[PDB]
Structures are given as C-alpha cells and as structure tokens.
Amino acid sequence: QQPERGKIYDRNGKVLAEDVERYKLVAVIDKKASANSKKPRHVVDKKETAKKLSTVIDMKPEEIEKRLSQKKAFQIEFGRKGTNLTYQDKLKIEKMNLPGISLLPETERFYPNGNFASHLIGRAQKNPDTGELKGALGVEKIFDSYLSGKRGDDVHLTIDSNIQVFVEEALDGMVERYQPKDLFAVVMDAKTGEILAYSQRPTFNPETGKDFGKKWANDLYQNTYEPGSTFKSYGLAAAIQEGAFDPDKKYKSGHRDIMGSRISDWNRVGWGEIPMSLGFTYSSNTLMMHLQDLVGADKMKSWYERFGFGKSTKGMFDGEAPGQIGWSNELQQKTSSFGQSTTVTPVQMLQAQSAFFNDGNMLKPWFVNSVENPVSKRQFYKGQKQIAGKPITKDTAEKVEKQLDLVVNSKKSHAANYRIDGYEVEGKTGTAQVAAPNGGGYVKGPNPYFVSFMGDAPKKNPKVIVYAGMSLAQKNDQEAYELGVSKAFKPIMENTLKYLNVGKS
Amino acid sequence: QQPERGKIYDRNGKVLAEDVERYKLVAVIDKKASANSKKPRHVVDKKETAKKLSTVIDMKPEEIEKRLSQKKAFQIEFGRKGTNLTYQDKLKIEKMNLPGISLLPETERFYPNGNFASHLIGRAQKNPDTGELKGALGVEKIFDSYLSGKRGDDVHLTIDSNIQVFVEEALDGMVERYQPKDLFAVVMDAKTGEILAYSQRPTFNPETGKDFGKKWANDLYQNTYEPGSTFKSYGLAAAIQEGAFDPDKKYKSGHRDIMGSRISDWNRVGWGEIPMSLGFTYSSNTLMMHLQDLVGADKMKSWYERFGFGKSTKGMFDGEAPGQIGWSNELQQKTSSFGQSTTVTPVQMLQAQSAFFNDGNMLKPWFVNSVENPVSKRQFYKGQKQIAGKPITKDTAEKVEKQLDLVVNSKKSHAANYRIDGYEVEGKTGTAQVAAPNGGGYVKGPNPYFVSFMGDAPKKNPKVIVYAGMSLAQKNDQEAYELGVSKAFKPIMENTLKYLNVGKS
Numbered sequence A, B: 001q002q003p004e005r006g007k008i009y010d011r012n013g014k015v016l017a018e019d020v021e022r023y024k025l026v027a028v029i030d031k032k033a034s035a036n037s038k039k040p041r042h043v044v045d046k047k048e049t050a051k052k053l054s055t056v057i058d059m060k061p062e063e064i065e066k067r068l069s070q071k072k073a074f075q076i077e078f079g080r081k082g083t084n085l086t087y088q089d090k091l092k093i094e095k096m097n098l099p100g101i102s103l104l105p106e107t108e109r110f111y112p113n114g115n116f117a118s119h120l121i122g123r124a125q126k127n128p129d130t131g132e133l134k135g136a137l138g139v140e141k142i143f144d145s146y147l148s149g150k151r152g153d154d155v156h157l158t159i160d161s162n163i164q165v166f167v168e169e170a171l172d173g174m175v176e177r178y179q180p181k182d183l184f185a186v187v188m189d190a191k192t193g194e195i196l197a198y199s200q201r202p203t204f205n206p207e208t209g210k211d212f213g214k215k216w217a218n219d220l221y222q223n224t225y226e227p228g229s230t231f232k233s234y235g236l237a238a239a240i241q242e243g244a245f246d247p248d249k250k251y252k253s254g255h256r257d258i259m260g261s262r263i264s265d266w267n268r269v270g271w272g273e274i275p276m277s278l279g280f281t282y283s284s285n286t287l288m289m290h291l292q293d294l295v296g297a298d299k300m301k302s303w304y305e306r307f308g309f310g311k312s313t314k315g316m317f318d319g320e321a322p323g324q325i326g327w328s329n330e331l332q333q334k335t336s337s338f339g340q341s342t343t344v345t346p347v348q349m350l351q352a353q354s355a356f357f358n359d360g361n362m363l364k365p366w367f368v369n370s371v372e373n374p375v376s377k378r379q380f381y382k383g384q385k386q387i388a389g390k391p392i393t394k395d396t397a398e399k400v401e402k403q404l405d406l407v408v409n410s411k412k413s414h415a416a417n418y419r420i421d422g423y424e425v426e427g428k429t430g431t432a433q434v435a436a437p438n439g440g441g442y443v444k445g446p447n448p449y450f451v452s453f454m455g456d457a458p459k460k461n462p463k464v465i466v467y468a469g470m471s472l473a474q475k476n477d478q479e480a481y482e483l484g485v486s487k488a489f490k491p492i493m494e495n496t497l498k499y500l501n502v503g504k505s
C-alpha cells in the first residue's frame, strides 16, 4: 500500500536513510487452524516453542510462554521484541520448523550507519496500522512531504560520511573523557559554506530509536549559547575597520569598572600597558571593553547585527533560533564584547567567521545539496553558495586573520595546545559561563564553563572551518577548562585535512 | 529563563496541560567542596546516604552508591529517577539533612489527568540545556508558536473532561476485552460540530512519556479506514434525493456478480424480494449495489464528493489525511457502495453524518474553542460552528433518519445490542475487512474486521453523535464480530446523555 519513502544521501551518494523489508513474528495458537491438516499449523508445545524463540528474540522463555497462553486468541505477536527482525533472524526461526510460527514482511526505515549525524538526519516513525512513515526530527521531518510518496523524492546532503566518521569518533572521546552535558562539532567548507560534518552529544540512534526524544534540539540551528571569547573576532573586525584597533598601539590592561562590577582580565592583574595585538593573543577582556568605548556603543550594536547576530540565518532547518544581542545596559553591552550575555547559534558563528576568508563576504551555511525524484528526474531544489552579507572589507578580513594566526602561533600564545604537527592552524578560544535554566544565574561549580574553539586550516587560506563546543564537563572539569576542546579539534582537523589531500609540512 | 508555556484548557476551564516546578537531585561528592566550611558540603557517608535516599527516589541503594563512587567528578545526578521530584519529596529529602545533597528547581510540563485525550492534547518535550519546551504532537505541536512565550497564550479546547472520562473508561474496557490493534471513539455535539471527547488505543501518557512515539498518527484526523457499512447512509441519502430509494418498493436481494467476484448479502442467500427499507435494516449489500446502478456510477461519485469524502475537512489538526474514493473500476465502485475500497477519516464520517440532523447541512467538526493570552487578553482565534456544505435537502435528511431509527429499533433489527434502556438510539453498524500493510489483499484470520457504529441520541433530535471503531480484535474476535463496538457505545452514550441532562424513560 505505502509508496517507497525517498532516500537521504551524503554528498558522495552513500545511503544515510532508506526503506528496507524486515519481519514480524506471528504465532497461531488456535487448534482450528489445524482442522484440515495432518501436520499441525498451530503451536502444540508452548513451552518448547518459547524456549526456542528466546534464542532469537530478546525475551525470556517465561514471558514468551505467558504470551502464548492468552485465552480466546487466534494468533499472538510479541510486542517490540517480535518485530523489526532481520532476514537472518527469519532464517534461523524458520529452520526450527515450529508449528504455528511464521514471519510477516514489513517495511522499516533503515539507517545504515546507526548513530551517525543523528540530529541532522532525524528519524522517521512508523504508523503500525498502515505502515505510513512520518519524519519526527531533522531532515526526515523538514523534507517529509518530498520524502513521502509512486516513490518519494530523495534528499542529498552536503555531509561527507568520511569526515563525519572523524567527528563521531572525536565526540565519543570527549564523552568518555569529560561527560559533558552538551557537546557539538561542525566542519564547514571555508570557501562554499557546505556543512561537511555535524554531530552533537548526547544524541539518539535513529536506527533503534534509543534516546530519541530526550533532547529535541539540534545544537547547530536550534540551541543557543553565550559564545565566550570566540565572539571577540567580530569586535576585533569592527574595531579594525573603524580605525580603533592598532596592533602596535598600547592600551592599559588590568580591569574596568562597569556599573559597579569589576571586569578584569583573566589573570586578575593584567599585564600593564601592552600592545593591542598581544592583548588579543592573551584574550584580554579589557582590550575588548576598551575597543567598544573607542568605537561607541551604538555603532558596535550595528556591527554585531551586520555580522548576522540576533537574526536567523534562514537555513532549511526547522525552528532555527535567532539568538539575541545583549545590549540593554552598559554591563550587558560590555560583557557582550567578550561573548557573555549575548546568545548565538553555532550556525551564526560559522556564517560570521566565514567573512574572514572570503574577502569580507559571509557565506550562508548550507547542508542540503538537492531534493529530486530518481524516477521522474525532477529537481525540486538545488543548494548553492550564497553570500549572506559583506560586513567588512577585504583589508579588514586580512588583518583579523593575522590576529587569529597569532592567537595560536604567537611565541606568547596561550593556545598552543591547538597546534597540529605538520599543519598550520589558526583560530580563537572561548570559555564562558552557562546560564542556569531555572533561577536567574549561572551554573555553579568549580569550572562550569562552555569551552569552545573556532578554528580553520590551512591558516590564511583554509579549506575548512571547524567549530567545536563543550558545555559543562561533569568529569575532568579542570582539564576541560585547561585544554578546551583541543582533544576534539585536533583529531577532526588533522584527519579532515589529510582526507582533503592537504599536504603536511 | 524560559517564558511560562501557555496552558491547554478543556471547555469548562479545567487544566489539561500547564508548567509546574519540580526538583532534581544533586549530590556533591568531592571533598574539596568542604575546604573552608564548619559543616561538610559533600557526601561523607556513602552508605548511609544511599540507604536514606532509597526511601524517596525509586532506586536500589546499591545503584545509588555506585553512582556516588564516580571518579574525577565534583557532583553527580541520578538519571530519570532523580528528576521530576515533587515539592513533598523536596521536603522529605531536606529534613534528612544529608551533607552534599540539594535539590535544583526545574520546570516541567504537567498533564494533570495523565493518559487523557493524549493523541489530541499531545506532548511537549524539554531541552535539558535551556529548559525550552517544544510540542512534539497534537495541540502542543499545532499551537506551539502560541503556547511558547512574558507568557505564552492559552489554548482552550471544546473537550469536556467529564465526557472524556466516560470515553477513556469505555476504551480501557474494550482493550481488556478484545485487545484490538486499533480503537477509537469520538463524541460530537450533534448541533454544533464541537468535539466533546476523543480517545484512541493504543496511545501514550503525556505526563510520563510512556509509549510516546509508538504511533504518531491521530486516528480522528490522520488515520484512514475502509469504513464498511456505516458508509451506506450516504449512498442511501443519495438514492433518496435522486428518487431511486422508495422504502416500500421491492428489490431482488441475494448476490451480484461483478468482474468475476460474487458479492453477496451477509447471509449468502439473501431474503428474496423484500422492501428496500428492510434491505437497509438488514444492511443488505445488494440493496446498495442496486441503488448505485439506479442512480448511476458517475453521479454516485459526485455524491460522495458532495458529502466531503476524498478531501480534507480543513480542520486545525496537522497533516489531516484526505482519504480516497475508490472508483477505478466497477468492482471498486460497487464495493465502495458498502464502504470497502474507499478510505475515510473518522472526522469525515462525523462531518457527513451531521447532515442528517442539521436539515442537510454538514457541520465542520472542531475542537479548538479559543487561543488567547491571559495577560494581554488578546484573542488570537475563536472557534465556531461552520457549515461544510449542504449536500441534501431537509426532506432527504428526515427520510435517512427514519431508516437509521429502523436499523436499531425495527422489530427485525440485527442491531438490538446497541439499544440503551431508557433512551432512544439510532445509527448504523459496520463490519469491514482491513487492508494488509504489506503484500496485497486483506488481513487474514477468523474474524479480521474493523467493526464500528455511527450512533446518535435521542433519536431524530440528537444531543450527541458517538462514532466508535475497533480494528482487528486479537482476543474475543468472534464476540467483536457479533457485538461490534456495542460494549463501548452503550456506556459512552448513556453516561453522556445523563451528564447532559437528557431524561430517561
């Protein structure tokens, strides 16, 4: 009855989701089925049958024999344990030659990679009455009308399964090491905006349904973060274009007094009068507050808006969050300079960061390559590189890139743990407090931080941008503070560059 | 924090869904927390702590101490058993005065009635990071833009919790008795189209989440059925208005031969030359095929479209199914005359049935009374009675009602099991085969039927229409065939009529 639901593909044609035939176990227990037959067509020994069935379906013989003993029933099924059985399960059941036992073909949605870009691909759910499948999250839901049928259309993603494996492995390592409450990593083509890989933790397995529903939100498009100091790059860009930033000019570091709050550099005492470039390498908060004064508060708010913040990127993901620029008072304004109070989505961060490597042009990130029917060959949609806006000049973009280089590679860098032997890396570190969901403060604890890194490589002319973020390590929180996401950035970026044939040296 | 999510109300202002404060259990286990303190601020006695917590949260003391022994962790939590704790649990944990133990407030979505109109109300799921709630099904999803905030708007439904209680209890009894694969009942105000009660089985509990996801489809709006002989009332109305049906005129019963299929009256042999009125009371299939010949197949197809079949009712529910009139050959056309091949939604059946009690006007069924903000008092939406179309004259409607009376109350009735002592009832029975999801044909088995009853009372001038359907009884399938859904219709209708102050005779 149901039309075949279309497939979801990665950018090289690997199947990410497709319909398959599986099998459901049925046991006829009524004698009436065997009235006309010499060999029985119903279960004659319920105990032996239960014992043999327990060697295939995940159910104890005692529960099977209980289900076989239901009164006033012609045939029985075994709930979830008796459905979605494989062809090999079917073979071993059938070789037992158990009277009354058969297997019914049923259509199931199959995700060949299991837990793999799960919050992007989503999950399609089955209506048992009809077999009708309906997407409940991500691409399966966004494109449900196209995917469902004739035959539904296929959706091709920009995701590269080879790069996605690197991301899934690195994120597993972060879970083991740090048990964070939230975790994401994303890899984008620095020159086109294509999402090459995306994952988050915790997540679900779309194949089995394990943990589906425990977190509805996709981190890339629907979750918001106070970004911390990765956000300083946009304040730097603005201050550069306005002439307030001079890399060699000195400024007074240490602290600033804003509406009765002491906002200090991370070492409390500062470094005296130091060049602005060094302050950016040190990730000086007083530098950013100084530059905001020089530019002017009204102008800086417009600057963050021109970089796309506070607005949806208008991607094809459902319910994209807008974030919010925290600007309601001077304290909010000043803390926004280093990525506190303001909330962003990771996709806004990627869009904004792409400006520095595309002559000032922001690229709209995208992950849908095409929607098209393989039978009719109709192309309903084709993704493309699109400029989201040009907030800065090419000259400003280069001067920002020079400072991002210094953050990682300066002889005074405090981010050398993001270096990769053989490759040149650049980017910006972040450590931020995390808003408590309930009650009006920050999560309390020894190191209750969202730590992140917006990185790109090769430096100056990158092939990819890799952004990774970790919220609230429940294990090794002190090291999470010290090393940030470097134990995820380094395996993802190194393997990705090798796979993209970037020569090491 | 998140704005308060708006409430879902029943028609009398009873809360169906609301935000509440609950509590999450946290245990600080690292000694470092107690460095400066005159009282320990971490769990010092792991066994005494675990033993005492087991008297509140539902966990074995051995498991609790296992989690208290996690290494390199400042504090731990206790999974699902440790969240959604009540204010009373908070009191009981706190008088225990356990060092290191506190409770964090969290906002949860509370459904005070538990498993109650679950497939209509739906469920909102929580993002652990932010506390943000998002509707995943039903009203919570449909109106999620309104419900989420300030404060979200409230949604008021037409549902009456008192009638809804009757439906839930009756459906539980049908599950206990027949263990059907699918089951629904709906109660509609016969003069306004308001849905006073709706339930289905199997379903989920929106409070706990138990079984949420096993069936995405709301039976009323999204599931389709081959209705069986309840569909005959619309062919009857057509034949009346076209002058083909005359209650006293004779016709030849027995069987008909259509494209190599023998279609018989239910007793195989028929009853000879009998009055058309009696044929309709006996639920004669040959009567309906004869009337279709008399009207003409092209014209009958237009008749069903005029009753709203094959098209969505344009209700407020997402993804409403349109169904389909099966008309592609004479076999489909003839089997459609008695409700096979054509598929309908229950809401189309209610809409079509309302014509007989509103002088030929179909009423568009509706379940949303209001969407409105309790703070601003802005009314975003107000539901109302709306005519879906007038397919028949008042004269035709009266003549149909006379035949519906006879089905139940004729001295030759085969539906006397739908009678209610003290109340006058009318309606139409149905028994239909069920299409197999995979492979062609119908579900096989001794009595593999969708059985149903489209009823209304008091007869002629009803207060409510009650439509109940049961697909594929897995227990007592013989009784399901004999009694249909009478064991649900009678308690629902009787209790509803008493609750609505209809006096019994």
Ligand SMILES: *C(=O)[C@@H](NC(=O)c1c(-c2ccccc2)noc1C)[C@@H]1N[C@@H](C(=O)O)C(C)(C)S1
Pocket: A227, A228, A229, A230, A266, A282, A283, A285, A338, A339, A340, A429, A430, A431, A432, A433
């Ligand atoms: C940007 O992220 C900046 N971070 C903060 O000032 C900051 C902190 C903090 C935590 C621990 C020690 C000092 C400060 N908590 O919330 C915020 C917003 C600077 N950059 C960071 C980085 O990781 O590069 C730091 C730690 C150097 S401070």
Ligand SMILES: *C(=O)[C@@H](NC(=O)c1c(-c2ccccc2)noc1C)[C@@H]1N[C@@H](C(=O)O)C(C)(C)S1
Pocket: B228, B229, B230, B266, B282, B283, B284, B285, B338, B339, B340, B429, B430, B431, B432, B433, B449
């Ligand atoms: C309408 O529902 C009609 N039903 C059928 O003819 C029918 C059957 C069937 C099942 C069992 C015995 C005889 C027929 N299977 O599929 C169909 C479409 C008539 N009305 C029914 C009713 O309950 O009123 C019956 C059983 C009287 S036949």
